[PDB]
């Protein structure tokens, strides 16, 4: 299952993964030596009580220079450089963890967004956007923190090992009683409480669902609630379900606190018991072993979050991990459209027996036929969600037809020339969603700039009377989609964005549904003038907004009728 | 600002608040007693001779005890009994806190949800659902978890008060050094790291929105992305924004880890200092003062989460707190409709010059005239945004008009009888939002059971041939909005739900939009036959569905023309 990991990471990503793995081991050796460095220093300081017992001062300090109180201070500041050094080195390690995790958050997510951009429009249509968005930004945060949790896990299990080795290097019955008492505490909390952690933890997820769902549902029938006027039948189901949500939630916040509270009374008991074994058993080394009792203290102080993070990354390697890496390939190994070829449009746009519906949806057409000569300016009158936008999705390069040909100058519209065919069409989606940046980038759609191609477009899209009064001019921040741009201002910008492509076919797609009565016809004429040199397809949800359209195709229940 | 508190909470919520706050003070004495029980037990475990000296430990030595080693062991189990008692004690305290917080998460949200359910229909229309939803379950969530933080804060500052006082009794120079060293580390970290925590932490909130908005904008323009074909212009604005979001996130999760990593070096250095400083000073009682080292160890080990929970509750008392309490006097003290009277309907529903607009908008009508006789079966033909549902919501008891009479048998529809007139109308929404419960509860609208009238409702809503194939039948948990229920069967419940009200006027409101003509025509024919004994206002969105409609009022752009 590990083979799916190396498939995503590259040389700037893989080499960084190894650096953290070695540093995870080295940071462990740094912590151990930082602990072990207390033992000599505090042996010599505690050796002052027993005067002289071993060659540790009067019989050891006389090997370099200086007196006793000077070598105990120098050893003291020697302890505090190593600890400030560690405090910086351990901080740098926890910085490389974030630099690698959040750097892969970008390096990985940069490609999945391209994958869902290259799939056919039908494959982007079958899955909703509230799912693809999570497929290109939700999975990456989980994988990044999972690899970081994996590297931090290696650092920790290493810290635990060699620090336990340092404890075993000191005492026998204690480190034995300590290891036994530690693994006894690793139990119960992981086998009797950890099940109840989710036994009352997923019942809280059950209760939160049972509360949010009936709360959102209750707000929708507010009209029907005002008609009923009696809210008793609704609040008698709300108070009992909220009270069902209440205790199902308090049992989660109770069993999530028992482990640490019990671990505190334990930690106290395993602490004072590290003492009751030293004074009773006659290893009474006022400095030899009283130094080591401080080593057990510091070791435990470095060991409590040491054991906590292991279970944290363990749950992170089960909650995440195997459920994230598999979907990754499948979503990024996904297939994308491949076609090379050109096509020319000078005569008419034959359709030739389309017959189409979505993947698992019924056929909203069946033997749908029409043709569009250059410059007809046709329309598509329909009943909303019946098959207008579906048919126009078929006319354009999107949606490969079932039994259709869609001829262009007696030449079929297929994947070879659909790439070049998609270039000469704008969209202008009336309720156009802009991104918070300059309107110039919103017209160019980010594809750099061309200035000599923007002023003419703005002048044609009747935005010239709009750029003058803006504070930053063409550089003013558009503010999300609209906000700073009202509906028809977004229309003019959408028209400008389409005109910037220098197209030959323009499609409206309900371009009159998000405006007032006065703002529609002016924009429609402002489009009719700049479409005199072009063609046009209109998906009007109403009649008389097309009038100047020489063709009016009304799609009913599968068949295409013609009006004006 | 504290006066806003007692207005919401009652007497029980005050007896329980004192229950928690006195416990908050007492749990500090239990911890200190659990720590202060160590120094005697350890000063007697080491120096056995204390059990035949001092006016405190002499006679108990020869009261059933016999030797000295037997009583010190007894003292040990007495401590672990106290520590298991203390662990159970703290588990009960942290059990009442979560019971009070998640208890007020229900008690408050129940009142706020009841308040938003009884306001006028116009006040509920102006604000979106996610705002109200978070106003009745997100705001309650923050205030609930805030009160517990204040209690825990006072409990916490208390345990720091008497644990620091217990340390002062033990030592003079050591506690003084620790306090100076603490308030030196309480400084620097709160004024040098804390700025960069938010200087790179609220920059994260900045970069996250600036990274999501340009990503979520591209998904809505995926159609135009396929047309442009070139993604380099989209990815040159994505890679440059992501390489900025990358570093903007690595520095946040780094500076949020600088404290505790520097804190480790602090904890290490303040430990070996204590024992070295206490081993250089010649108070070496072998046990008298070297046991006090263990009290300092247990005191600090109890003071690390002690310092963490104080700032956690202080952040909870600033991040939330003042932003929640004020917005409840402005959410709970909300005003609601009045009136107490009855109304009768038997002749005509004269509208007579409606003219209506919302709070601060324009008027969609300006003189709108019609009249509805009992049993006229009228319809409203308009556009997708003209005001088709507005006029009908004006005819019925909803929507207090600006200049409209809404006469009912030459009697005015006002607040005294709007309740009674709302009682005699049923909505039957086509895209009905069902709740995951038995279909009987769905039809009753939660108003308990009623097999008498309710059994007749199923026979009227022609669900009987669908209840038969249903596994649980009338008690079938419908399965959220629409599990195995097709669109037509959802409509049958929509009719059944309003039929249980025993109404007099039936609304439809776009009862044709998302179902094939057949699966709806069978429902539309069912409607016209069961509407003979009542009146009905249809807000049809498409034509040919109002064949047998005797009246068809078409509202254009302010005036009302009549069709069939």
């Amino acid at each position: 299952m590990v083979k799916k990991l190396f498939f995503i990471l590259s040389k700037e990503d893989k080499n960084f993964l190894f650096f953290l793995l070695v540093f995870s081991v080295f940071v462990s050796f740094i912590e151990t030596f930082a602990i072990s460095l207390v033992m000599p220093f505090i042996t010599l300081a505690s050796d002052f009580s027993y005067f002289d017992r071993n060659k540790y001062l009067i019989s050891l300090k006389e090997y370099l220079n200086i007196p006793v109180f000077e070598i105990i201070v120098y050893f003291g500041v020697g302890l505090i450089v190593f600890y400030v050094f560690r405090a910086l080195l351990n901080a740098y390690y926890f910085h490389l963890l974030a630099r690698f995790s959040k750097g892969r958050k970008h390096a990985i997510a940069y490609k999945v967004f391209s994958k869902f951009l290259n799939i056919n429009y039908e494959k982007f249509t079958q899955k909703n956007q509230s799912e693809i968005l999570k497929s290109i930004t939700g999975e990456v945060y989980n994988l990044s923190t999972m690899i970081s949790s994996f590297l931090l896990l290696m650092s920790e299990i290493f810290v635990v090992l060699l620090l336990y080795a340092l404890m075993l290097l000191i005492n026998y019955k204690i480190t034995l009683f300590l290891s036994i008492f530690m693994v006894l505490n690793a139990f119960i909390l992981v086998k009797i409480l950890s099940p109840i952690i989710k036994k009352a933890g997923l019942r809280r997820e059950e209760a939160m669902k049972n509360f949010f769902e009936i709360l959102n549902t209750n707000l929708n029938n507010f009209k029907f609630i005002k008609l009923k006027t009696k809210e008793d039948g609704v609040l008698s189901l709300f108070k009992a379900q909220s009270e069902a949500f209440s205790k199902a939630n308090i049992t989660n916040e109770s069993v999530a606190a028992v482990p640490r509270i019990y671990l505190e009374g334990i930690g106290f008991c395993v602490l004072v018991f590290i003492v009751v074994f030293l004074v009773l058993k006659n290893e009474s080394d006022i400095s030899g072993i009283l130094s080591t009792i401080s080593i057990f203290v510091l070791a435990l102080y470095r060991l409590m979050p040491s054991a906590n993070r292991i279970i944290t990354s363990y749950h992170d390697l089960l909650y995440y991990h195997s459920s994230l890496n598999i979907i990754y390939q499948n979503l990024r190994q996904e297939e994308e459209n491949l076609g090379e070829g050109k096509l020319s449009f000078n005569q008419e746009l034959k359709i030739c027996n389309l017959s189409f519906g979505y993947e698992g949806k019924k056929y909203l057409f069946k033997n749908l036929n029409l043709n569009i000569k250059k410059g007809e300016k046709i329309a598509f009158i329909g009943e909303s969600g019946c098959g207008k936008s579906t048919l126009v999705d078929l006319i354009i390069g999107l949606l490969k037809p079932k039994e259709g040909q869609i001829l262009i100058d007696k030449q079929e519209l297929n994947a070879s020339n659909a790439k070049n065919y998609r270039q000469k069409i704008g969209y202008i989606p009336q309720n156009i969603y802009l991104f918070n940046d300059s309107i110039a980038k919103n017209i160019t759609f980010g594809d750099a700039v061309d200035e000599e191609k923007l002023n003419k477009v703005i002048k044609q899209a009747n935005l010239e009377h709009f750029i003058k009064n803006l504070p930053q001019g063409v550089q003013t921040k558009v503010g999300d989609g609209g906000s700073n741009l009202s509906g028809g201002q977004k229309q003019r910008i959408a028209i400008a964005r389409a005109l910037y492509l220098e197209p030959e076919i323009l499609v409206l797609d309900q371009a009159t549904s998000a405006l007032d009565t006065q703002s529609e016809a002016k924009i429609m004429d402002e489009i009719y003038k700049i479409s005199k040199d072009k063609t046009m397809i209109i998906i009007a949800h109403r009649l008389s907004t097309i009038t100047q359209c020489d063709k009016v195709y009304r799609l009913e229940h599968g068949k295409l009728k013609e009006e004006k | 600002m504290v006066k806003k508190l007692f207005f919401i909470l009652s007497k029980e919520d005050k007896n329980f608040l004192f229950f928690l706050l006195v416990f908050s003070v007492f749990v500090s004495f239990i911890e200190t007693f659990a720590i202060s029980l160590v120094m005697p037990f350890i000063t007697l475990a080491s120096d056995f001779s204390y059990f035949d000296r001092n006016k405190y430990l002499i006679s108990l030595k020869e009261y059933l005890n016999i030797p000295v080693f037997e009583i010190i062991v007894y003292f040990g189990v007495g401590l672990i009994v106290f520590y298991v008692f203390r662990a159970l004690l703290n588990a009960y305290y942290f059990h009442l806190l979560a019971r009070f917080s998640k208890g007020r998460k229900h008690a408050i949200a129940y009142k706020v949800f009841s308040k938003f359910l009884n306001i006028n229909y116009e006040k509920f229309t102006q604000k979106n659902q996610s705002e109200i939803l978070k106003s009745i379950t997100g705001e309650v969530y923050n205030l609930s978890t805030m009160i517990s933080s204040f209690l825990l804060l006072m409990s916490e500052i208390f345990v720091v008060l008497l644990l620091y006082a217990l340390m002062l009794l033990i030592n003079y120079k050591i506690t003084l050094f620790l306090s100076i060293f603490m308030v030196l580390n309480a400084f620097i970290l709160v004024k040098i790291l804390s700025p960069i925590i938010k200087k790179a932490g609220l920059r994260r909130e900045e970069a996250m929105k600036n990274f999501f908005e340009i990503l979520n904008t591209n998904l809505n323009n995926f159609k135009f992305i396929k047309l442009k074909t070139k993604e380099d212009g989209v990815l040159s604005l994505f890679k440059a924004q992501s390489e900025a979001f990358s570093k903007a996130n690595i520095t946040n999760e780094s500076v949020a880890a600088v404290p505790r990593i520097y804190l480790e070096g602090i904890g290490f250095c303040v430990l070996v200092f204590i024992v070295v400083f206490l081993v250089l000073k010649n108070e070496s009682d072998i046990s008298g003062i070297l046991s006090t080292i263990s009290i300092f160890v247990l005191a600090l080990y109890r003071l690390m989460p002690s310092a963490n929970r104080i700032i956690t509750s202080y952040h909870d008392l600033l991040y939330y707190h003042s932003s929640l309490n004020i917005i409840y006097q402005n959410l709970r003290q909300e005003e609601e409709n009045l009136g107490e009277g009855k109304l009768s309907f038997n002749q005509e529903l004269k509208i007579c010059n409606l003219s209506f607009g919302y709070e601060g908008k324009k008027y969609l009508f300006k003189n709108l005239n019609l009249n509805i006789k009992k049993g006229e079966k009228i319809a409203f033909i308009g556009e997708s945004g003209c005001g088709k549902s507005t006029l009908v919501d004006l005819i019925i008891g909803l929507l207090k008009p600006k200049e409209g009479q809404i006469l009912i048998d030459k009697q005015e529809l006002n607040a005294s009888n709007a309740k009674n007139y709302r009682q005699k109308i049923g909505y039957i929404p086509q895209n009905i939002y069902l709740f995951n419960d038995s279909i009987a509860k769905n039809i009753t609208f939660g108003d308990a059971v009623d097999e008498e009238k309710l059994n007749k409702v199923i026979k009227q809503a022609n669900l009987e041939h669908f209840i038969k194939n249903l596994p649980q039948g009338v008690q079938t948990k419908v399965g959220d909005g629409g599990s195995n229920l097709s669109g037509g069967q959802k409509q049958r419940i929509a009719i059944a739900r309003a039929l249980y009200l025993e109404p007099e006027i039936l609304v439809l409101d776009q009862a044709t939009s998302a179902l094939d003509t057949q699966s709806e025509a069978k429902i539309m024919d069912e409607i016209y036959k069961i509407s003979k004994d009542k009146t009905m206002i249809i807000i049809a969105h498409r034509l040919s569905t109002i064949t047998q409609c005797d009246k068809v009022y078409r509202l254009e752009h302010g005036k009302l023309k009549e069709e069939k």
Partner: nanobody
Framework: QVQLQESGGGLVQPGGSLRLSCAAS????????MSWVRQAPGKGLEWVSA????????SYSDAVKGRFTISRDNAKNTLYLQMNSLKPEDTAVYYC????????????????WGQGTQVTVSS
């Protein structure tokens, strides 16, 4: 539920100072750029000034150029506008509006409104 209420412009003789304060509610005040407009007696509408989200880029019109200085206070959620000298047109009641109201179509939008302060400063 966007509801704005500006109230700080009374009749004071020309050649002096008059700062109007527009209060806003119902939206993130900082993310939205703001503007000003006015409706003349008998005439349709007429634009005044504009400003960005950060308040670091200003805009005015030729009939009021070099006369006003616009400031944004993102603390009290208020949009100020200093005024000096009044013409038989600087009267049309300055409302507030939300985003960029400046073209001849996005003016027919009730993005704010709210009473208003009449400032008919004649000779």
């Amino acid at each position: 539920q966007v509801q704005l209420q500006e109230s700080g412009g009374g009749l004071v003789q020309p050649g002096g100072s008059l700062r109007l304060s527009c209060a806003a509610s119902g939206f993130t005040f900082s993310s939205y750029a703001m503007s000003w407009v006015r409706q003349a007696p008998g005439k349709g509408l007429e634009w005044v000034s504009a400003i960005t989200s950060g308040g670091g880029s200003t805009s005015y019109s030729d009939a009021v150029k070099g006369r006003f200085t616009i400031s944004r206070d993102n603390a009290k959620n208020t949009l100020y506008l200093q005024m000096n000298s009044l013409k038989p047109e600087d009267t049309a009641v300055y409302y507030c509006a939300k985003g960029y109201v400046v073209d001849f179509l996005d003016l027919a939008e009730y993005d704010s409104w709210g009473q208003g302060t009449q400032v008919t400063v004649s000779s």
